[model samples]
Target: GMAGYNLGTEWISLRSKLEMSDPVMEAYTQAYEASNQMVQAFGVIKADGSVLWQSNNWDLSADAQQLISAVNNQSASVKQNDVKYSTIRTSPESLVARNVQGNGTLILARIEDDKWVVAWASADAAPDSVYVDIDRAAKALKGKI
Candidate 1:
């Protein structure tokens, strides 16, 4: 399984296994809950706890914003404990190309825990650097796809 699972539709993914990972999932859960709560509170509360008209709309964008913030802040902490690498992939591991027409893709994979895994990634761009960067990070940090 990759981050979420062996297959995104497989009902079980590596993320689930990772969830079982003591410290990692524990921290993730805490961050996830805190972020969720923060977003809800942030969206509704005004300076003096007086609800603003917009805040009362119940759109919950405020909650999402706070959640995003929580994720951004906590990601650093989570990644800090992950294995990392740079310049880790080469020829067979991944390929890099220039998308002259601005539409191209690079595919990368590694025997992660013995599975031929691909990053859950694709995009349209001038150059396929996004692929390279993801491959680079995955390979360098040995990120499981």
Candidate 2:
């Protein structure tokens, strides 16, 4: 377990543990409660380029594929606190190719040894709290599978 706060400075840096109360269901919870949006889809993309464990309504187009890979690659980004957390984008349309319809937001987080966790939602559907919620959910899922 880990968290962040302001005390003349900042601190984030958290890891994984237990739980799998239905990943897709959990994603829905994060989307609605944390942000009040519906979860379009969520899952992980392995480092080897294979995608799995998802509710992907969107087809795995080149743009979506590359976005996942890019998120995993940039996972070293800093979090709300000071510790490096994961890569998050409120606007995924920017990275999406013109052909693809595009997902609103992408929260790429955690490393389950060769796999990175990711969740998607509409831009307007998510809040800052959604980021933290997704991070916690991702970490909760890390070593479980």
Candidate 3:
């Protein structure tokens, strides 16, 4: 479900399939399987830059917070680089390692004017596929949000 103080009338469903068929979920699975990139979950944010809806993970709250702070901070710097949103790089432990063990790629992208998505995975995942997976997650949100 979506979580935020205020949401738009036409909201997008966070209920993507958890297996190989679902587009968003498939990205996660493929990223992990192909290269150990976990691609844990994503979150929706408000125009003011607050998180609205977030994808679920077992116990990644702490890890998520750290990564969120870093990503949000990067948003400011990257904005000056000529894009509404851009890709970001972070450590897996700071992104999703608390829930899962080991190091990997914790990638993020701006899916909407008011939304951000975070992907956690091991560094082994090919950079090219990792980019695709995060963009796919953002694309999923673009359809609904």
- Give the number of the best model, judged by TM-score: 2
TM-score for each prediction? 0.23, 0.49, 0.42
Q: For candidate 2, lDDT tens digit of each residue in 1-145? A: 5787534222223422423223444644554465454543556555556565546454433344554555544432322112122333423221211112223455555545555566555544443545556665565556533
The better-scoring model by TM-score among 2 and 3 is 2
The lDDT leader among the candidates is 2
The candidates, ranked best first by lDDT, are 2, 3, 1
Better of 2 and 3 by lDDT: 2
Q: In the order shown, what is each candidate's alpha-carbon RMSD?
A: 19.0, 12.0, 12.7
| Local accuracy of candidate 3 as per-residue lDDT tens digits, 15-93 | 3422212333344443345444334444443435444333454223423343355554543122211112233334332
The TM-score of predicted model 2 comes to 0.49
Q: Write the per-residue lDDT of candidate 1 for residues 9-128, one digit (tens) a residue.
A: 543344443223222112222222433322211121122223222222233233333322222233211111121112222344332322233222223344243222222122332223
Model 3: per-residue Cα lDDT at residue 63: 38
Model 3's alpha-carbon lDDT is 0.42
